[PDB]
Design a binder for this molecule. Sequence first.
Ligand SMILES: CCOC(=O)CNC(=O)NCc1ccc(N)cc1
Length: 164
Amino acid sequence: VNPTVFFDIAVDGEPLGRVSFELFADKVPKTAENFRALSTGEKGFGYKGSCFHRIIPGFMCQGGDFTRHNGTGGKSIYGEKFEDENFILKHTGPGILSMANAGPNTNGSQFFICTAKTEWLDGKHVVFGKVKEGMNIVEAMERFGSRNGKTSKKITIADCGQLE
Ligand SMILES: CCOC(=O)CNC(=O)NCc1ccc(N)cc1
């Protein structure tokens, strides 16, 4: 029974809506657990109040850099970084949740949500969940991002946690 987690998104402090995700703990357990734990904040840190630093319309929404807020940071529940667990699952379309990284076996906390099929990232980024509800809210986030990823307003995870 795969976990469900939610993000409540704010544009410049003002509520936008809720995105929920199924985490594929059945296929990517170690990676699902890191995201589930960081969403609930139960280990004393996580996504709550963190930034979506890079939004590229037609491509993806990236965030989860809760230590440097700009794409150069983050940390896992297992230490600063952890392995690519496997590459069983693929970037099949919009809504796919996948780990960002800075090379092989460099996963921390940064993740991205796909707004298109991104097949080329297969074997390179670990897919561990997908958007369950509120894809329309990820599409609304998309509209504050730019060609180079810089957001026009501050997009944040106002609140996050587990639903199931
Ligand atoms: C479509 C996803 O595009 C990327 O992942 C581009 N990489 C990227 O921003 N890397 C910065 C980074 C630094 C440290 C950790 N732990 C994770 C990521």
